[PDB]
Amino acid sequence: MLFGRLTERAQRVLAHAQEEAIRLNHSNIGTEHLLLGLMKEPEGIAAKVLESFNITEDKVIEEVEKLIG
Amino acid sequence: VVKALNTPTLDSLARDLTVIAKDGTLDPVIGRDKEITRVIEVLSRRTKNNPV
Amino acid sequence: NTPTLDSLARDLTVIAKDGTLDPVIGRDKEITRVIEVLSRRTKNNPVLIGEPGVGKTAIAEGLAQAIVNNEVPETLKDKRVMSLDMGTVGEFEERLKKVMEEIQQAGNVILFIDILKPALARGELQCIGATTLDEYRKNIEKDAALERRFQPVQVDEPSVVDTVAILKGLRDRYEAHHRINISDEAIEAAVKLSNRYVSDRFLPDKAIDLIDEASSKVRLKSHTTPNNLKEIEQEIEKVKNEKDAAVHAQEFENAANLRDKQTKLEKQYEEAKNEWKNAQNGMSTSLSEEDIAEVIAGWTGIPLTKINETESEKLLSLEDTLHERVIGQKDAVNSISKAVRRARAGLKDPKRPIGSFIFLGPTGVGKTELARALAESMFGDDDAMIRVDMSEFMEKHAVSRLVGAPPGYVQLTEKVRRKPYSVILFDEIEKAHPDVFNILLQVLDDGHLTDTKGRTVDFRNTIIIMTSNVGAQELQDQRFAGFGGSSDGQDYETIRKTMLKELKNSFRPEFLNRVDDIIVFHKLTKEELKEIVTMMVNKLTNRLSEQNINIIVTDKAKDKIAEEGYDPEYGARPLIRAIQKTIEDNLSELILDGNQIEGKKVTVDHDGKEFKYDIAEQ
Numbered sequence: 027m028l029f030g031r032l033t034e035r036a037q038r039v040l041a042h043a044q045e046e047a048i049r050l051n052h053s054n055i056g057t058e059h060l061l062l063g064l065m066k067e068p069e070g071i072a073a074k075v076l077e078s079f080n081i082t083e084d085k086v087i088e089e090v091e092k093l094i095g
Numbered sequence: 096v097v098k099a100l101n102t103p104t105l106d107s108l109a110r111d112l113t114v115i116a117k118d119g120t121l122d123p124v125i126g127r128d129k130e131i132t133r134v135i136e137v138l139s140r141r142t143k144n145n146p147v
Numbered sequence: 148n149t150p151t152l153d154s155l156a157r158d159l160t161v162i163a164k165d166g167t168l169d170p171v172i173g174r175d176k177e178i179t180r181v182i183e184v185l186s187r188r189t190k191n192n193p194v195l196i197g198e199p200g201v202g203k204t205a206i207a208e209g210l211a212q213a214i215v216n217n218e219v220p221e222t223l224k225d226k227r228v229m230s231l232d233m234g235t236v237g238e239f240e241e242r243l244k245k246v247m248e249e250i251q252q253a254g255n256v257i258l259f260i261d262i263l264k265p266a267l268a269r270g271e272l273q274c275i276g277a278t279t280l281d282e283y284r285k286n287i288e289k290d291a292a293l294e295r296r297f298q299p300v301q302v303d304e305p306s307v308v309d310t311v312a313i314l315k316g317l318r319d320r321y322e323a324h325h326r327i328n329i330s331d332e333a334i335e336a337a338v339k340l341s342n343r344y345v346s347d348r349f350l351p352d353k354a355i356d357l358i359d360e361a362s363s364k365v366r367l368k369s370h371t372t373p374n375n376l377k378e379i380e381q382e383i384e385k386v387k388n389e390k391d392a393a394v395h396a397q398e399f400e401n402a403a404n405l406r407d408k409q410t411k412l413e414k415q416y417e418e419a420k421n422e423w424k425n426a427q428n429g430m431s432t433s434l435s436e437e438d439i440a441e442v443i444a445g446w447t448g449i450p451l452t453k454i455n456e457t458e459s460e461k462l463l464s465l466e467d468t469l470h471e472r473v474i475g476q477k478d479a480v481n482s483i484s485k486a487v488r489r490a491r492a493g494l495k496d497p498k499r500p501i502g503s504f505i506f507l508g509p510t511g512v513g514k515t516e517l518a519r520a521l522a523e524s525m526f527g528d529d530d531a532m533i534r535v536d537m538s539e540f541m542e543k544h545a546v547s548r549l550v551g552a553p554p555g556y557v558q559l560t561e562k563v564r565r566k567p568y569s570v571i572l573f574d575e576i577e578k579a580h581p582d583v584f585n586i587l588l589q590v591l592d593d594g595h596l597t598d599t600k601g602r603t604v605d606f607r608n609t610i611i612i613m614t615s616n617v618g619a620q621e622l623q624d625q626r627f628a629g630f631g632g633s634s635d636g637q638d639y640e641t642i643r644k645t646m647l648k649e650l651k652n653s654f655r656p657e658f659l660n661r662v663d664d665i666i667v668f669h670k671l672t673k674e675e676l677k678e679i680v681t682m683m684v685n686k687l688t689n690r691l692s693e694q695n696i697n698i699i700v701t702d703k704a705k706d707k708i709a710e711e712g713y714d715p716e717y718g719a720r721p722l723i724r725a726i727q728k729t730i731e732d733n734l735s736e737l738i739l740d741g742n743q744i745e746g747k748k749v750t751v752d753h754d755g756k757e758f759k760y761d762i763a764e765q
């Protein structure tokens with residue numbers, strides 16, 4: 027039941043993570059890419075969770091870029 | 096996220112397998128397709144339809 | 148109403164009154180025999196003598212059912228049948244007295260069994276036995292009181308036509324369950340194939356056991372989705388999941404669109420299902436004869452290419468198969484080919500064995516190879532051969548081994564019972580106990596035997612071949628009798644007559660009268676071994692098909708290796724040793740050297756001193 031329950035936005039998050047992995051010259055799809063893929067989907071329920079917690083798009087990108095190499 | 100969001104006799108006297116398998120918790124049975132097909136072919140018959 | 152008898156045993160007339168089970172078919176003679184014996188003044192206790200599994204319970208079921216159908220005569224009219232199982236066996240003796248008293252008082256209760264001697268002496272109980280012959284001759288015959296009170300009745304498996312009638316009688320009971328249209332031609336093919344191979348549990352369970360997968364295969368193949376409904380069902384499921392997620396997301400703007408899409412997909416799925424089921428119902432589930440053959444191919448392991456035959460080209464291809472597997476000496480092949488077809492057609496007596504050939508000649512010529520080739524070309528199974536060595540059958544106590552252990556002490560009959568269609572081969576028949584010769588003569592004449600337990604084995608479909616080493620000294624003298632030649636130029640009939648004349652001196656004159664044809668093997672020459680080497684090379688290449696390696700051996704190497712172990716007495720035994728120690732020793736090292744010759748071509752050539760190996764592309 028891996029792909030039998032994912033919604034349309036769930037696959038969009040995975041596609042965003044996959045396309046961000048190529049640009050960052052990373053051969054491994056780590057957990058740091060799924061976070062970026064989720065942040066670029068302001069339509070899901072999780073979008074309201076981060077919006078209400080003063081979590082924007084530009085801050086998380088630089089915060090995760092600093093941690094990773 | 097929370098705030099922003101039938102034959103009952105046999106059910107209690109035994110355990111139901113397809114209910115748990117529906118939730119997607121059991122390990123996927125891989126490589127037993129031949130046995131599954133043999134069992135379903137044997138089971139679908141008027142006589143001698145109880146595979147062992 | 149005999150309440151005690153109705154509670155301590157199971158009543159059959161109540162079950163037969165409703166008729167929920169299939170009626171007893173093919174037992175129209177056993178019922179009449181039972182009702183005739185029960186009407187006799189003396190020996191009114193019939194016994195169902197027979198091996199378990201032949202349908203002894205069906206006889207009692209039919210006897211009980213005949214009461215409901217009003218087919219029993221006035222002697223057995225409106226009389227219930229009660230069966231007492233062996234699982235209810237002091238306090239035990241206190242119930243049977245009341246049961247027999249109730250039976251005597253009522254007068255319409257018929258006892259059935261699988262202390263009581265005074266009861267049977269006066270004939271107050273019309274019990275019907277169902278024990279096997281071995282127990283009947285061990286516990287009943289030893290008592291004189293029950294000897295004149297029980298009438299033995301022979302109950303065994305019916306005929307093939309009776310089995311066909313039984314299968315056709317219950318056709319509806321199988322066709323109405325899974326809605327399968329069983330063709331008439333499939334019944335006869337199924338009953339033929341079931342008796343051809345499955346002959347262990349007797350009738351009727353060895354013939355009705357084929358209809359469990361043959362029809363189910365086509366039923367399941369025609370019941371699947373041809374990539375039409377599965378995609379629509381997946382789309383419906385994903386739309387339903389998306390709609391549920393939207394409902395739980397408090398976003399009803401897309402809820403209407405999702406509901407409309409789900410309704411449209413449901414309508415499309417209903418239309419597709421209707422149009423598919425109309426097409427499916429437009430045709431019937433007819434059955435072919437190939438399904439039964441496929442099922443029996445997996446039941447016994449026999450390849451489908453052998454089972455799918457009309458039993459007409461097998462005789463023609465027997466000679467070709469024997470010539471291919473056995474190199475040279477076609478006289479024996481032609482002599483045995485003519486005799487087997489006469490018996491197969493029906494010219495020979497059906498009770499007598501099909502083949503009664505005798506193998507004669509020097510050792511190492513390949514008699515076992517010819518026997519295996521014949522068994523494969525006639526029955527299709529290489530391992531369906533039973534070999535009994537007469538070296539151990541030299542004393543008088545050895546005669547009680549192949550026929551079975553007599554009661555009081557604790558082979559061939561037991562093994563041949565499970566495989567009636569098997570080739571039987573014997574060795575050192577010239578040195579055996581005299582009683583074994585009498586047993587073999589009885590097999591060749593009568594066509595069947597009987598063990599100490601009373602069970603009758605079958606030898607009508609068995610081929611008996613006896614290998615004798617006597618007379619080998621005469622053949623070798625003829626080869627060297629004349630300089631520049633041998634006896635190969637002589638006619639085969641003259642040598643056969645001389646060997647037959649020399650054979651009857653040591654054996655019994657009447658023992659050789661049943662032999663269809665005397666088989667005499669020739670000698671191995673230089674040219675014969677060249678093709679044997681080629682056959683060995685071909686077999687080795689065939690055994691290396693998994694590694695995909697092509698091996699070719701030049702005729703020079705074959706000639707060089709043929710003379711390494713040339714000996715008429717040994718035969719072909721040194722050839723295998725020479726082949727294994729020359730080419731295979733180097734082949735194994737090349738295989739183990741990191742797949743050096745994997746997927747390549749290996750050439751064996753003899754330059755005069757050694758065997759140079761060439762490795763190139765394949």
Ligand SMILES: Nc1ncnc2c1ncn2[C@@H]1O[C@H](COP(=O)(O)OP(=O)(O)OP(=O)(O)O)[C@@H](O)[C@H]1O
Nearest residue numbers: 473474475510511512513514515516679682719720
């Ligand atoms: N023409 C032939 N082509 C190939 N192989 C042959 C040929 N003739 C004989 N052989 C081989 O000879 C071998 C001799 O072994 P086999 O056991 O058959 O001998 P036999 O002569 O029947 O004697 P025995 O009864 O003592 O075993 C056989 O295994 C067979 O492979």
